[PDB]
Amino acid sequence: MSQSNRELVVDFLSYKLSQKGYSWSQFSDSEMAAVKQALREAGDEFELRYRRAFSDLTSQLHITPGTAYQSFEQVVNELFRDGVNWGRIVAFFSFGGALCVESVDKEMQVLVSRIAAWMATYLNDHLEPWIQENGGWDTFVELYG
């Protein structure tokens, strides 16, 4: 179905994981992809602004293997209930990234593959209808350099 959002999710999570020294390979087995670069900078900036107003997102929620999934869906649903904009989509990515980074630090590597899967499915089922009806992913690159 060419849901290449998977590639976007993995690319973003790999970047966040690489920052902490890990590799995406450890947890899981037309070249206009400047969105990859655009999303990384955006994610970095979001986390920077978030960690200034509050504590960094990596220490916001207390996670356990059995708590993770219900906690992820609960957050995302409340984030997108009153509307969808490009800022909240960046919030969506940097949140999932913070979860992966935390889950590894708290030694719950099992979640990393799933967080990606959780993000990818929601990005296909509930967000892409908004994406191309707002100009696709390039529009994001244009508006946010």
Binding site: L57, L79, G87, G145
Partner: peptide, 21 residues
């Protein structure tokens, strides 16, 4: 009983004001 919504709102607070690139 969720502190998850508080996180979602904190996310929205920065996300909403994120149009000023």
């Amino acid at each position: 009983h969720q502190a998850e919504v508080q996180i979602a709102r904190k996310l929205q607070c920065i996300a909403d004001q994120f149009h000023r690139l």
